Amino acid sequence: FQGAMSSSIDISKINSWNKEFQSDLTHQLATTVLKNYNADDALLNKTRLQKQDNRVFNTVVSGRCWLFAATNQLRLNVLSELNLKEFELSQAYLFFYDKLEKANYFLDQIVSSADQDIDSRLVQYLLAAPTEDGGQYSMFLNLVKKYGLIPKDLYGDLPYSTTASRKWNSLLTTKLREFAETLRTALKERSADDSIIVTLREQMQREIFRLMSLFMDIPPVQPNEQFTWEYVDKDKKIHTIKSTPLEFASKYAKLDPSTPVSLINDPRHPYGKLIKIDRLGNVLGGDAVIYLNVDNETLSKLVVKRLQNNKAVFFGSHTPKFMDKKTGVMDIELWNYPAIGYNLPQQKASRIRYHESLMTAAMLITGCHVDETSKLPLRYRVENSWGKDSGKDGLYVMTQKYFEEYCFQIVVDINELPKELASKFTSGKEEPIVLPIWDPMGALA
Amino acid sequence: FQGAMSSSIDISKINSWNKEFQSDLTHQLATTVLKNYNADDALLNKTRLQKQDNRVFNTVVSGRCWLFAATNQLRLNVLSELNLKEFELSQAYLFFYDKLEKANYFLDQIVSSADQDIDSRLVQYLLAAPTEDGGQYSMFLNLVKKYGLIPKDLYGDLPYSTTASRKWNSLLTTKLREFAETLRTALKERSADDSIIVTLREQMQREIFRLMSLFMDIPPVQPNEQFTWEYVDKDKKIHTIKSTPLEFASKYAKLDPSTPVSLINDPRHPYGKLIKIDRLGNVLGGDAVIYLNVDNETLSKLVVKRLQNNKAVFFGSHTPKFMDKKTGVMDIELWNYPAIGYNLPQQKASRIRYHESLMTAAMLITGCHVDETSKLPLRYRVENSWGKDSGKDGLYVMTQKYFEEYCFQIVVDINELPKELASKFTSGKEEPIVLPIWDPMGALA
Amino acid sequence: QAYLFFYDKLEKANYFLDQIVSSADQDIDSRLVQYLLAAPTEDGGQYSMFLNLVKKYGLIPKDLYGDLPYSTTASRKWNSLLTTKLREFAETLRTALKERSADDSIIVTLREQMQREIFRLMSLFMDIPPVQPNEQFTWEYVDKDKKIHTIKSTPLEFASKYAKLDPSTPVSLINDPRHPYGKLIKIDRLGNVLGGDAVIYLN
């Protein structure tokens, strides 16, 4: 009894506390202002903004954020290779196959977890959001290795659902939840390899494809089928390229799928270890989401090194934590929360464990400023798919502390790594730390 | 030298003070918020608003603010007398003649001050804004005594300039400034009664009228000329009234111009004295702006008494000081300026002398709440011409302290006064305190 | 409605601290602890959570406590700020519970400091209501005929004498075909006021 009483909200206590707080001048001002405006709007610190909103970067390179971020370098490679003024790869092309493959992958996840109760943690998680739009770099390579890439000119963002996919996803998900029950019900009486189950699964793939084809057309050419693409170079001369999507991704966009690797700063785990997310994927049998865990000093140096190689860096962060979209500044001290006594001592590893921080989006680091001493990076230039309308004409500036605290993953080429880190990936000796499918270091918008 | 140095802004001093202020938590919060939002928006105190925004009034009555306020009672009288559902008097009618008479009055003010230098304080003041839209209750009676009143149905707010008079006023004023020079130049060689001056003045009246007639039509009937007005009573029956504007103001609108008197709380001066504003007027030879100075206890009692007689009270205040248009609350403590250490100890008389407070507008008190004890008024219900769009569906609530501090004038009927106050007006023994034409207790919008 | 909304949030934040202490024996990544950490101060409720509040706090006219504050109509930011703090507090509690018993004076003190910080933060976004549940308020109003009246009552008396709520009469029925009809169904742990009634339905 005494404990439950002490654990209860006591009306005398809260009214006594209220009297004490009302006697403090800062509190009086704070409650007046914060009953009038959104706290971020009220506390944005223009004195701090004035100093941090610095767009000089001494180290720079010459729509589903994850697809824009993963494809931008390849878009630039073509632009370069064909001497074009402007050029875009088709993000819709990858989006269509990503959804189809994920829906298909879900059927396989349901069959492989059919031994678990319907209310088990994994089966419920699988049923929660099987066809969402997010991905990861390995999920992007899985798609490009099977489907290749094509110019946006041949398959654009025309359909309603390419820019407002919520309804389409909900309709496909409702059907997938129906199918999971049909599969699980059929698996009680049979083995998965039973011809009846195999037939059921094919009919489901067919229904998924039929439904998807109502909202988007299947791309115009198969991966090994040639397309013809007519274009104008920066000088106004016309050309015609005949290529297949797979040849295009290699010959013109110069993607070598064997070079990219992901590094992450996940302080919940030992540095130097590989970390693998169980079950997270899109294409059945494709590669896993795997990261090499490293400290922030290492992560920061690799970003600078990649930038010096003249290549942008795909990174995963907790958007929009401490991100001001109007000014395009990512700074954890941009808002004066300490002035209302609101401080956050929880450290990175614990923020992750305690459901406070996770990866939510992919963006690109396209530049940075290394201190004009023999030194370190102070801030990064960041670009994303939102448009010149967001940020400062589309550009964001991120502080080194933001990168250390609210960013996690970067993608670099294996050749840019020190031999002892590169060997973590090449010498099949490493045993990864395997995390659940629902881990916060997962899919990115 | 030492004095001039001490009187200068010293850079070390201000930067030292800045360091001290930045060490205070309240100041840190305040400068963060106030660089983001308008101070009134940031400091509006919703805790105070919650208590003061009380629309229960136990003492209630059953477009140029000054014309709306002066004419509303008369509008109600007709509504009553003719059993109408709705009815409006023509404010445009009075507005047209007010402007014409003021322009004419200005010519007379210029002739009477022709002995003073062009850069004298009075001549420059006369030239500053001779045809503005504001008035006073005595300026309203001056017009009704000469022109009468008519239904808005016969002369409405149709012309552009009735609702956006700035351009028209500027064009008329530019011409009046030209005319002042022509008159003053002619008066150097002649007496004012010289036939040449008399002729000049008539030509100016003619040009003023011509110009005014371009922006508004002269009313359709003369003051002693009959108009015919067809209308529908609240029961849908039709009637026709034949009356002249002067008869209409008396027979139907029941205005007895000999009953209204103005009282004012102007603590710069002794209470019990009449106060007269020199030269302020509209119709040449019309009555002066005269007030009887009284303390706030007396002023407050008279408002309550008039309300009990079921009549609204025309009053003059410093709009929009401490007035929140969105919630329609007039309360001098509604904004938490003390929370940023902003306090105003200057008292009423000094606010007036020091150019801080003055009468700027006329509105109507239509109700009040007298404390349910044998007591005093706590708040007033206020209405004005801005529309149901302003305030709370058009209604404002004003605190007793606001009335005491930022209101000044009320208009009551002489019969509502105590005999010793009424005698101030009736026994030609009182010598008024005469104030300059530019006094702050003047014209009202 | 704001009156109930304020106390609902305060009580739920408090309830969350108790849920964390009672599940401290489970791993941080367990299904329940992660669920508790997902959205501890959201705006939703249930009829039993409403009776729990009215039985403790009563009801008052909106005239005395309206929807004036920003957060009463756009609560997302306020909830996010309170939740970030609650996730910090869950770790502080769980870390302290490894070395101590829950009834340890150090834990009791920690919990009270957390209640205080939760209340402080809430008071920045909404004022605590103007009167306590058993404290009288004065309410002036106008009836449909334009006559004025003044009622003197407390929030608890108001909910009974004027709003006529008898908290012992309401019951919830549900059609949940996952389960046999005629059975009571209870949702484990779902609540707002610590020790208040459970969410129970008759199928």
Short mmCIF file of C-alpha atoms in Angstrom, two decimals, chain A residues 23-405:
data_model
loop_
_atom_site.label_atom_id
_atom_site.label_comp_id
_atom_site.label_asym_id
_atom_site.label_seq_id
_atom_site.Cartn_x
_atom_site.Cartn_y
_atom_site.Cartn_z
CA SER A 23 7.62 31.49 -8.44
CA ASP A 24 10.49 31.13 -10.95
CA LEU A 25 10.66 33.91 -13.53
CA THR A 26 11.99 31.65 -16.26
CA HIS A 27 9.17 29.17 -15.78
CA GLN A 28 6.60 31.97 -15.86
CA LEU A 29 7.94 33.16 -19.20
CA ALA A 30 8.29 29.65 -20.59
CA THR A 31 4.71 28.59 -19.86
CA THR A 32 3.39 31.81 -21.32
CA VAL A 33 5.25 31.28 -24.59
CA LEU A 34 4.80 27.54 -24.89
CA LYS A 35 1.02 27.69 -24.54
CA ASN A 36 1.17 29.99 -27.61
CA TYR A 37 3.62 28.33 -30.03
CA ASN A 38 5.10 24.98 -31.08
CA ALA A 39 8.22 24.50 -28.91
CA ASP A 40 10.55 24.14 -31.90
CA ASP A 41 9.24 27.35 -33.38
CA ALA A 42 9.56 29.21 -30.10
CA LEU A 43 12.97 27.92 -29.14
CA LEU A 44 14.82 27.97 -32.47
CA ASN A 45 17.97 29.93 -31.52
CA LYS A 46 18.79 32.53 -34.15
CA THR A 47 22.08 33.43 -32.36
CA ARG A 48 23.20 29.81 -32.88
CA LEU A 49 21.69 29.66 -36.39
CA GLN A 50 23.76 32.69 -37.38
CA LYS A 51 26.96 30.82 -36.65
CA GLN A 52 26.05 27.30 -37.79
CA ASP A 53 24.41 28.13 -41.05
CA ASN A 54 27.78 28.23 -42.83
CA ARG A 55 27.74 27.03 -46.47
CA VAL A 56 31.50 27.18 -47.20
CA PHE A 57 32.92 23.69 -47.72
CA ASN A 58 36.57 23.11 -48.56
CA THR A 59 36.07 19.45 -49.50
CA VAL A 60 33.36 18.99 -52.10
CA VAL A 61 32.59 16.74 -55.02
CA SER A 62 32.76 18.27 -58.49
CA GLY A 63 11.08 10.16 -54.79
CA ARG A 64 12.10 7.78 -52.06
CA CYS A 65 15.15 9.14 -50.42
CA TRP A 66 16.87 5.76 -50.51
CA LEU A 67 16.49 5.35 -54.27
CA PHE A 68 17.58 8.95 -54.98
CA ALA A 69 20.57 8.53 -52.69
CA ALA A 70 21.60 5.15 -54.03
CA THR A 71 21.20 6.21 -57.66
CA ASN A 72 22.64 9.70 -57.76
CA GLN A 73 26.25 8.65 -58.31
CA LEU A 74 25.18 6.41 -61.15
CA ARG A 75 23.14 9.23 -62.64
CA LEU A 76 26.30 11.42 -62.56
CA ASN A 77 28.42 8.67 -64.16
CA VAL A 78 26.06 8.56 -67.18
CA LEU A 79 25.92 12.33 -67.33
CA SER A 80 29.68 12.28 -67.55
CA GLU A 81 30.05 9.28 -69.87
CA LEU A 82 27.56 10.61 -72.46
CA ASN A 83 28.42 14.27 -72.14
CA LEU A 84 24.87 15.25 -71.13
CA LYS A 85 23.60 18.56 -69.76
CA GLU A 86 20.90 16.88 -67.62
CA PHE A 87 19.95 13.24 -66.93
CA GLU A 88 17.97 11.16 -64.53
CA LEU A 89 17.79 7.39 -63.94
CA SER A 90 14.34 5.88 -63.43
CA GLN A 91 13.61 5.62 -59.72
CA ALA A 92 10.12 4.31 -60.57
CA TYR A 93 11.71 1.31 -62.28
CA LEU A 94 13.38 0.19 -59.06
CA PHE A 95 10.36 1.17 -56.99
CA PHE A 96 8.06 -1.12 -59.01
CA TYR A 97 10.31 -4.17 -58.70
CA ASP A 98 11.12 -3.44 -55.07
CA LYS A 99 7.43 -3.59 -54.13
CA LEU A 100 6.76 -6.70 -56.19
CA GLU A 101 9.76 -8.51 -54.73
CA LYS A 102 8.93 -7.46 -51.17
CA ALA A 103 5.37 -8.69 -51.50
CA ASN A 104 6.78 -11.97 -52.78
CA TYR A 105 9.38 -12.06 -49.98
CA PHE A 106 6.61 -11.64 -47.42
CA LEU A 107 4.88 -14.84 -48.69
CA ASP A 108 8.16 -16.69 -48.13
CA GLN A 109 8.53 -15.16 -44.63
CA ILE A 110 5.06 -16.35 -43.76
CA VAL A 111 5.75 -19.85 -44.96
CA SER A 112 9.02 -20.00 -43.05
CA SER A 113 7.40 -18.83 -39.81
CA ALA A 114 4.25 -20.97 -40.12
CA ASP A 115 5.35 -23.01 -37.11
CA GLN A 116 4.92 -19.97 -34.87
CA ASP A 117 1.67 -18.83 -33.29
CA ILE A 118 -0.31 -16.12 -35.16
CA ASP A 119 0.23 -13.78 -32.20
CA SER A 120 3.97 -14.41 -31.97
CA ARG A 121 6.26 -11.43 -32.07
CA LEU A 122 7.70 -12.29 -35.51
CA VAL A 123 4.44 -13.17 -37.27
CA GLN A 124 2.76 -10.01 -36.03
CA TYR A 125 5.78 -7.95 -37.10
CA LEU A 126 5.69 -9.52 -40.57
CA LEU A 127 1.99 -8.61 -40.86
CA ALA A 128 2.46 -5.00 -39.72
CA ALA A 129 3.82 -3.32 -42.90
CA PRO A 130 4.99 -5.82 -45.58
CA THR A 131 5.02 -3.46 -48.57
CA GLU A 132 6.34 -0.12 -47.33
CA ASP A 133 8.52 2.07 -49.51
CA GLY A 134 11.81 2.00 -47.56
CA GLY A 135 14.99 0.07 -48.31
CA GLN A 136 18.73 -0.25 -47.67
CA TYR A 137 21.80 -0.19 -49.83
CA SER A 138 21.97 -3.98 -50.03
CA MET A 139 18.30 -4.07 -51.04
CA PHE A 140 19.16 -1.59 -53.81
CA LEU A 141 22.07 -3.77 -55.07
CA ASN A 142 19.78 -6.82 -54.91
CA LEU A 143 17.44 -5.05 -57.35
CA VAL A 144 20.07 -3.64 -59.68
CA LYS A 145 21.79 -7.04 -59.97
CA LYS A 146 18.53 -8.63 -61.12
CA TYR A 147 16.88 -5.77 -63.05
CA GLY A 148 19.56 -3.30 -64.04
CA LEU A 149 18.82 0.44 -64.57
CA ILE A 150 17.15 2.53 -67.24
CA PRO A 151 16.87 6.25 -68.18
CA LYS A 152 13.87 7.97 -66.50
CA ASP A 153 12.93 9.03 -70.08
CA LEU A 154 11.72 5.47 -70.64
CA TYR A 155 9.76 4.98 -67.40
CA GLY A 156 8.89 8.04 -65.34
CA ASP A 157 6.90 9.05 -62.29
CA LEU A 158 3.67 9.39 -64.22
CA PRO A 159 1.26 7.15 -62.18
CA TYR A 160 -0.60 8.54 -59.21
CA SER A 161 0.76 5.88 -56.90
CA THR A 162 4.44 6.67 -57.66
CA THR A 163 4.05 9.95 -55.77
CA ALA A 164 1.23 8.97 -53.34
CA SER A 165 1.68 5.28 -52.63
CA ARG A 166 -0.23 5.01 -49.36
CA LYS A 167 -3.54 3.77 -50.78
CA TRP A 168 -1.88 1.27 -53.13
CA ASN A 169 0.22 -0.07 -50.22
CA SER A 170 -2.84 -0.43 -48.01
CA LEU A 171 -4.75 -2.36 -50.73
CA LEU A 172 -1.79 -4.67 -51.37
CA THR A 173 -1.24 -5.17 -47.63
CA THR A 174 -4.88 -6.08 -46.96
CA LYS A 175 -4.58 -8.77 -49.62
CA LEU A 176 -1.24 -9.99 -48.24
CA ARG A 177 -2.81 -10.41 -44.77
CA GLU A 178 -5.59 -12.48 -46.34
CA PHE A 179 -2.93 -14.58 -48.16
CA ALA A 180 -0.93 -15.15 -44.97
CA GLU A 181 -3.95 -16.77 -43.37
CA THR A 182 -4.66 -18.86 -46.49
CA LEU A 183 -1.03 -20.09 -46.48
CA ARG A 184 -0.88 -20.77 -42.77
CA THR A 185 -4.26 -22.59 -42.88
CA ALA A 186 -3.01 -24.75 -45.83
CA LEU A 187 0.28 -25.46 -44.05
CA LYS A 188 -1.49 -27.06 -41.09
CA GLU A 189 -2.62 -29.93 -43.31
CA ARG A 190 0.47 -30.03 -45.58
CA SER A 191 4.21 -29.75 -46.05
CA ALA A 192 5.44 -26.54 -47.71
CA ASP A 193 6.83 -28.47 -50.64
CA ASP A 194 3.39 -30.02 -51.19
CA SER A 195 2.20 -29.30 -54.74
CA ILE A 196 -0.92 -27.72 -53.29
CA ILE A 197 1.16 -25.13 -51.41
CA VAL A 198 3.40 -24.52 -54.42
CA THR A 199 0.34 -23.88 -56.56
CA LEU A 200 -1.22 -21.62 -53.94
CA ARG A 201 1.93 -19.52 -53.76
CA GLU A 202 2.06 -19.09 -57.52
CA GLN A 203 -1.56 -17.96 -57.62
CA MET A 204 -0.72 -15.39 -54.91
CA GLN A 205 2.25 -14.09 -56.89
CA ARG A 206 -0.09 -13.76 -59.86
CA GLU A 207 -2.71 -11.84 -57.85
CA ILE A 208 -0.03 -9.57 -56.37
CA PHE A 209 1.29 -8.80 -59.88
CA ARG A 210 -2.22 -8.24 -61.24
CA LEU A 211 -2.98 -5.77 -58.48
CA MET A 212 0.34 -3.97 -58.91
CA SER A 213 -0.19 -3.67 -62.65
CA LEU A 214 -3.38 -1.69 -62.01
CA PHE A 215 -1.38 1.08 -60.31
CA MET A 216 1.86 1.04 -62.31
CA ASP A 217 2.81 -0.61 -65.59
CA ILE A 218 5.42 -3.29 -65.59
CA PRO A 219 8.57 -1.63 -67.09
CA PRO A 220 8.69 -1.62 -70.95
CA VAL A 221 11.68 -3.93 -71.35
CA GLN A 222 12.99 -6.97 -69.53
CA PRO A 223 16.47 -6.85 -67.84
CA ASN A 224 18.27 -8.57 -70.69
CA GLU A 225 16.06 -7.07 -73.40
CA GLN A 226 17.36 -4.16 -75.46
CA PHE A 227 15.76 -0.74 -75.25
CA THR A 228 16.42 2.10 -77.69
CA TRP A 229 17.00 5.51 -76.08
CA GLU A 230 17.22 8.75 -78.09
CA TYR A 231 18.79 11.75 -76.41
CA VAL A 232 20.43 15.14 -76.91
CA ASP A 233 23.90 15.88 -75.54
CA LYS A 234 24.90 19.20 -73.95
CA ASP A 235 25.79 20.44 -77.41
CA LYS A 236 22.37 19.75 -78.98
CA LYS A 237 23.46 16.78 -81.09
CA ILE A 238 21.16 13.77 -81.09
CA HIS A 239 22.22 10.19 -80.34
CA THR A 240 20.60 6.81 -79.98
CA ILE A 241 21.86 4.17 -77.57
CA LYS A 242 20.75 0.57 -77.85
CA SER A 243 21.33 -1.28 -74.58
CA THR A 244 19.63 -3.55 -72.07
CA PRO A 245 18.88 -2.42 -68.50
CA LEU A 246 21.60 -4.73 -67.13
CA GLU A 247 24.21 -3.56 -69.65
CA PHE A 248 23.15 0.01 -69.02
CA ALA A 249 23.82 -0.21 -65.28
CA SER A 250 27.36 -1.45 -65.98
CA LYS A 251 28.55 0.01 -69.29
CA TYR A 252 27.07 3.47 -68.88
CA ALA A 253 26.26 3.95 -65.18
CA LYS A 254 29.51 2.14 -64.20
CA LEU A 255 28.08 0.28 -61.18
CA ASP A 256 30.31 -2.59 -59.93
CA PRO A 257 28.06 -4.26 -57.33
CA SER A 258 31.04 -5.93 -55.64
CA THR A 259 32.60 -2.74 -54.35
CA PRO A 260 30.07 -1.18 -51.98
CA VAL A 261 30.11 -1.96 -48.29
CA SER A 262 28.33 -0.35 -45.35
CA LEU A 263 29.90 0.83 -42.15
CA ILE A 264 27.87 1.86 -39.13
CA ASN A 265 28.47 3.48 -35.76
CA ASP A 266 26.22 1.38 -33.48
CA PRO A 267 27.70 1.74 -30.00
CA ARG A 268 25.40 -0.91 -28.61
CA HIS A 269 27.95 -3.34 -30.04
CA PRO A 270 31.71 -3.89 -30.13
CA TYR A 271 33.54 -2.01 -32.87
CA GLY A 272 35.24 -4.19 -35.49
CA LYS A 273 32.35 -6.66 -35.67
CA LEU A 274 29.97 -7.31 -38.52
CA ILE A 275 26.35 -6.73 -37.74
CA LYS A 276 23.61 -8.49 -39.66
CA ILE A 277 19.89 -7.79 -39.62
CA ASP A 278 17.98 -11.10 -39.61
CA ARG A 279 15.40 -11.51 -42.37
CA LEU A 280 15.44 -7.90 -43.58
CA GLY A 281 15.28 -7.99 -47.39
CA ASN A 282 13.40 -7.59 -50.63
CA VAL A 283 14.52 -10.15 -53.24
CA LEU A 284 14.20 -13.80 -51.94
CA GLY A 285 17.71 -15.24 -51.63
CA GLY A 286 19.35 -11.86 -52.14
CA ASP A 287 22.15 -10.45 -49.99
CA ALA A 288 21.65 -9.57 -46.32
CA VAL A 289 21.76 -6.15 -44.71
CA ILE A 290 25.25 -6.29 -43.17
CA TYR A 291 27.29 -3.49 -41.63
CA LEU A 292 30.83 -3.30 -40.23
CA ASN A 293 30.66 -1.53 -36.84
CA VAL A 294 33.26 1.23 -36.40
CA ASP A 295 33.93 4.18 -34.12
CA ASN A 296 33.02 7.72 -35.20
CA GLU A 297 36.60 8.76 -35.79
CA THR A 298 36.87 6.01 -38.41
CA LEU A 299 33.45 6.75 -39.85
CA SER A 300 34.28 10.43 -40.15
CA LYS A 301 37.66 9.80 -41.86
CA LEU A 302 36.06 7.52 -44.45
CA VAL A 303 33.51 10.18 -45.37
CA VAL A 304 36.29 12.70 -45.88
CA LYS A 305 38.33 10.18 -47.89
CA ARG A 306 35.41 9.28 -50.16
CA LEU A 307 34.68 12.98 -50.72
CA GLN A 308 38.32 13.46 -51.67
CA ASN A 309 37.88 10.68 -54.25
CA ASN A 310 35.18 12.97 -55.67
CA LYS A 311 32.23 10.71 -54.77
CA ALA A 312 29.19 11.57 -52.62
CA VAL A 313 28.41 9.46 -49.55
CA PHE A 314 25.10 7.64 -48.99
CA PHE A 315 24.33 7.78 -45.26
CA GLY A 316 21.54 6.69 -42.90
CA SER A 317 20.31 9.03 -40.15
CA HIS A 318 17.47 9.69 -37.76
CA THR A 319 15.48 12.19 -39.87
CA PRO A 320 14.06 14.67 -38.87
CA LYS A 321 15.63 14.73 -35.35
CA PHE A 322 17.27 18.14 -34.81
CA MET A 323 16.70 19.03 -38.40
CA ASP A 324 15.26 22.43 -39.30
CA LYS A 325 13.65 22.08 -42.71
CA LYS A 326 13.12 25.79 -43.25
CA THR A 327 16.80 26.78 -42.90
CA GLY A 328 18.17 23.37 -43.85
CA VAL A 329 20.40 23.04 -40.72
CA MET A 330 21.02 19.74 -38.81
CA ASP A 331 22.41 20.78 -35.43
CA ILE A 332 21.58 19.24 -32.08
CA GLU A 333 21.94 22.60 -30.28
CA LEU A 334 19.97 24.74 -32.72
CA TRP A 335 16.96 24.89 -30.34
CA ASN A 336 17.37 26.43 -26.90
CA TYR A 337 15.78 23.66 -24.89
CA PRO A 338 18.32 24.18 -22.06
CA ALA A 339 16.67 27.60 -21.53
CA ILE A 340 13.51 25.82 -20.38
CA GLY A 341 15.56 23.29 -18.40
CA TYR A 342 15.03 20.51 -20.96
CA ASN A 343 18.24 18.51 -21.24
CA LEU A 344 18.86 15.07 -22.71
CA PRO A 345 21.68 13.09 -21.11
CA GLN A 346 20.76 9.71 -22.67
CA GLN A 347 23.71 8.47 -24.74
CA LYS A 348 23.64 7.07 -28.26
CA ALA A 349 23.68 3.38 -27.48
CA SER A 350 20.94 3.85 -24.92
CA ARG A 351 18.86 6.07 -27.23
CA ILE A 352 18.88 3.13 -29.64
CA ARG A 353 18.02 0.51 -27.01
CA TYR A 354 15.34 2.62 -25.44
CA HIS A 355 13.30 3.28 -28.59
CA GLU A 356 14.39 6.86 -28.89
CA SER A 357 16.64 6.88 -31.96
CA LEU A 358 16.83 4.78 -35.12
CA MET A 359 17.66 5.06 -38.81
CA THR A 360 14.75 6.50 -40.71
CA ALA A 361 16.18 7.92 -43.95
CA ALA A 362 18.96 7.96 -46.51
CA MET A 363 20.55 11.13 -47.81
CA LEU A 364 23.85 12.19 -49.45
CA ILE A 365 26.89 13.89 -48.08
CA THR A 366 28.26 15.90 -51.01
CA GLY A 367 30.87 17.96 -49.22
CA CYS A 368 32.48 18.81 -45.94
CA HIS A 369 34.76 21.36 -44.27
CA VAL A 370 37.95 20.03 -42.73
CA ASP A 371 39.56 22.35 -40.21
CA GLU A 372 42.30 24.50 -41.80
CA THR A 373 44.82 22.99 -39.51
CA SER A 374 46.09 19.46 -39.90
CA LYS A 375 42.63 18.33 -38.78
CA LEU A 376 39.05 17.05 -38.74
CA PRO A 377 35.64 17.67 -40.32
CA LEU A 378 33.52 20.47 -38.82
CA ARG A 379 30.40 20.23 -40.93
CA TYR A 380 28.99 18.41 -43.94
CA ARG A 381 26.99 19.45 -46.97
CA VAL A 382 23.88 17.27 -47.32
CA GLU A 383 21.46 16.79 -50.19
CA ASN A 384 18.28 14.78 -50.44
CA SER A 385 15.24 14.15 -52.67
CA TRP A 386 12.84 16.73 -51.21
CA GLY A 387 13.53 19.50 -53.75
CA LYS A 388 15.05 22.97 -53.93
CA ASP A 389 11.92 23.80 -51.97
CA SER A 390 13.20 22.22 -48.76
CA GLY A 391 16.34 23.37 -46.94
CA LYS A 392 18.44 26.18 -48.38
CA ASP A 393 17.55 25.86 -52.04
CA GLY A 394 17.59 22.13 -51.35
CA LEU A 395 20.87 22.10 -49.44
CA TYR A 396 21.41 21.18 -45.79
CA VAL A 397 24.40 21.72 -43.52
CA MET A 398 25.04 19.15 -40.81
CA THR A 399 27.39 19.56 -37.89
CA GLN A 400 30.08 17.05 -36.96
CA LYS A 401 28.29 16.45 -33.63
CA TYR A 402 25.02 15.71 -35.46
CA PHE A 403 26.87 13.22 -37.63
CA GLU A 404 28.32 11.56 -34.53
CA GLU A 405 25.05 11.39 -32.62
#
